[PDB]
From a paper:
The N-terminal methionine is deleted, leaving an alanine that is acetylated and interacts with a pore-lining isoleucine residue where RNA editing regulates fast inactivation.
To mitigate proteolysis of the N terminus, we expressed a construct containing mVenus and the affinity purification tag on the N terminus, enabling us to purify the protein with at least one N terminus intact within individual tetramers. We therefore used a cylindrical mask covering an asymmetric region of the protein to initially obtain a low-resolution map containing an L-shaped density in the region of interest and then used an L-shape mask during further 3D classification to obtain three classes (A–C) that contained additional density within the pore or chamber. We tentatively conclude that class A corresponds to a fully inactivated state in GT Shaker because the non-polar region of the N terminus inserts deeply into the internal pore with the N-terminal Met (now at position 3) interacting directly with I470. Density corresponding to the additional two residues present in this construct is visible within class A, curling towards the intracellular end of the pore to form an inverted J shape.
Author numbering:
A (entry chain D), B (entry chain B), C (entry chain A), D (entry chain C): 216 to 252, 277 to 298, 310 to 327, 357 to 489
E (entry chain G): 1 to 15
The structure:
């Protein structure tokens, strides 16, 4: 048989069934985590049974995603590894890439621009270390310093360079505010540079799709 | 008559009267909601009379907006349905599109790139689910965890992915701050990719307008 | 005379003196507002004498700025009009445009793209009114509603559309957070449309001057 | 010798050793600042011995960075100068530029675009002064003013112009919120204007290096 | 983006 990869009149209903099952599994995940809540386990078992059935029908990276989606359930049959498997259960969301034409374009854009992504993470790491050390040593003299240590300032440097915002910020001297202004400017610039190459690769793969 | 569709032969008086009545209705809406406050109903009835007269003399999406602008006033003549009709009264603001040549360019841009908006909402959905699950499972081990559940973290993931800012963020461990840094960078990238196609569509329609 | 426009050698030192006097007047302004504080008035009178001497040597918008720079000092020789004149004293900072070759490029960019700036302010007004009405009617049913009225929500809609961040946001229901996410994404899309035309013309003017 | 500046099979060993030593020095910095903490001084002495050996073997700007990386260690062998030297110790992070081909592209982009960087800092200074004085005089009439002085408003104007977010903003009147909305719009426009030439210079150097 | 700040590079929009 092996009609699944092709999209025929009898196959498109199978694709709709797979997309609905994936969305139902994601919903069961986000709902079973809720404080108000066995009945979820039955739906999760049905979803994993459909997943294993599709994988056996197909038995690249999408196959690795199909395997990773099923692995955590079979593992369940210190505490940190249990929380890690409960977290890696989320990877079921990536099976939408099998059906989504646009998500594959994003994956090809990421594979085609790993160097720019590494350059972006490098610039963020350099700016974070620099502005964290600067704001900490600016605050070192004041009594009851806002930043206990340079690593403590990493979160403030990250939220400032990305223009997310640290929220409350008042208990800070003039030098810390000057370093924060420079941090915001430099973070806007460093975020602004690698991005256009990635946007160009995405637009290229997208228009190649059409 | 049929003077309304063309703004010519001294029909500009009718167009300025329509724009003034629309702005007056919007102001009456925003002031009627004020805590300090019958006379507002009189001005609202006058604006509705002008709207229904313009529509009945005029007799596409613009006619649908002209109908929706006047339906809620007549519907008034579960409390949630009352709140919904009071909210849908706002749609009078879209009557300006008939007079604003630039707003129609925005409507043509939104129509030409519906796939772009869908891809953008899809990327935000995937990123919100992923980073919410990550930050929640990172916070699960702490006492008095800041995030009661994955759905509870959806708002934090949205405000971080868009670089709006969650505000206060202290009661969070190192792993949550790491996930938040990754969330800010990934939101930067995910909102940086579909948008330029929409900008190109808007720039093309704007140059076509002149 | 008339060496001021055509800078040469002796006319160059006059330009550096004018720039120093302008910066000194701005510093005297920002220091005169300080809580810790006659001596400031003497430096202000000296800067006003230099400004009036340059203006009388001069005898377009540049002369208008030169007039506005000295008007408040001579007006001083309800309380709200006094606060307004103390505010309009700040316009001395625009005297730098005569010496800053880049600031004139910014002024030509603003004059050459007024239609785009107005279209941007229009889109912001539309989005602010719409999302403010939405978030208010979403919060109306909750006890101790966060938003007393739609106008009260205008500041939240403005900081969300521009992604500045409202700060603490917890006392809000699910519908208000949904409207806030939609407001954030729509704010990305609105501001990011008009802007490229203002860049294109700014870049044109800049490189033409180059 | 001069074995360092080639790509010989022995040379990659020395390159990876220098990169690991630079990263270990940055780590020793960031952990020696920690509240929980001689053993760090031994690793610092080893990193400085390696840096001085690399410098004495090597013997522009790169040599100046290599000098600055080792100067603070030998300086130790008012308190404010001690804080300044402890801060300038961070410059070891810039030794990575010798190995990172992308960091040199960033340095060439900065050297080649000093003029627009100065224009951007100029626009930020102008907008900060203007909006700070505006929000201060708008808030001057309220009892218990949120802004004690125009300089006190500089941090708010900076975080708003860059859309980082001041945090809580409620104790402010209508006029201050209006000035804040204008500040957010103008800051987005003034930040966006000079970036694109910097991005174009960066992509030019990145493709010339390709 | 918001402050992702795309620098265009879509052929300047071809206009
Ligand atoms: K932002
Ligand atoms: K923000």
């Amino acid at each position: 048989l092996f009609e699944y990869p092709e999209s025929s009149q009898a196959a498109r209903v199978v694709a709709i069934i797979s997309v609905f099952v994936i969305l139902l599994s994601i919903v069961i995940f986000c709902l079973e985590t809720l404080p108000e809540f066995d009945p979820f386990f039955l739906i999760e078992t049905l979803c994993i049974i459909w997943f294993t059935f599709e994988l056996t029908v197909r038995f690249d990276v999408m196959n690795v995603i199909d395997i990773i989606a099923i692995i955590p359930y079979f593992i369940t049959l210190s505490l940190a590894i249990l929380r890690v498997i409960r977290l890696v259960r989320v990877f079921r969301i990536f099976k939408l890439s099998r059906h989504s034409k646009g998500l594959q374009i994003l994956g090809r854009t990421l594979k085609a621009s790993m160097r720019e992504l590494g350059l972006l993470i490098f610039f963020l790491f350099i700016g974070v270390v620099l502005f964290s050390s600067a704001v900490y040593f600016a605050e070192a003299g004041s009594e009851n310093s806002f930043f206990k240590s340079i690593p403590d300032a990493f979160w403030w440097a990250v939220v400032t360079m990305t223009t997310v915002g640290y929220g409350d910020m008042t208990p800070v001297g003039v030098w810390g505010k000057i370093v924060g202004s420079l941090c915001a400017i430099a973070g806007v610039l460093t975020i602004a540079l690698p991005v256009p190459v990635i946007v160009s690769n995405f637009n290229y793969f997208y228009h190649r799709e059409t």
